[PDB]
Structure of Hg(II)Zn(II)(GRAND Coil Ser-L16CL30H)3+:
Amino acid sequence: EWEALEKKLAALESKCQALEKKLQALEKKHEALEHG
Amino acid sequence: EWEALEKKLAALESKCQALEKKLQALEKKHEALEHG
Amino acid sequence: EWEALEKKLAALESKCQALEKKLQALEKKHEALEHG
Ligand SMILES: [Cl-]
Ligand SMILES: [Hg+2]
Ligand SMILES: [Zn+2]
Ligand SMILES: [Zn+2]
Ligand SMILES: [Zn+2]
Ligand SMILES: [Zn+2]
C-alpha cells in the first residue's frame, strides 16, 4: 500500500534536506574566500 | 489517494533540480579556479 | 497505479545519490585545499 511509498518519500525528503545543508555550507565557504 | 503523494513527489523533484543547478554552479567555480 | 509512482521515486533516489557523490567530491576538494 501507500505506507511503504510514504516512508520511502519521507526518507528521500530527509536525505535531500541533509544534502541541501551541506551544499549551503560549501556556498558559505566560497562567500568567505571571495570576501577576504 | 495518489494526489497528495504525486504532489509531494513533484515538489521533491523540483527541490532536487534546484539543488543540482546550485551544485553545477559550485563545480563551475572550481573549474574557473583550476584554469587560472 | 503504484508502478508509475515507484519508478518515479526510484529515478529521484538515483538522481539524489548521483548528486550526493558530486557533493562529496566538492567536499574532498575543500579538504585538500585546507590541508596544503
Ligand atoms: Cl564547492
Ligand atoms: Hg535530492
Ligand atoms: Zn567549492
Ligand atoms: Zn559575495
Ligand atoms: Zn578543468
Ligand atoms: Zn580538514
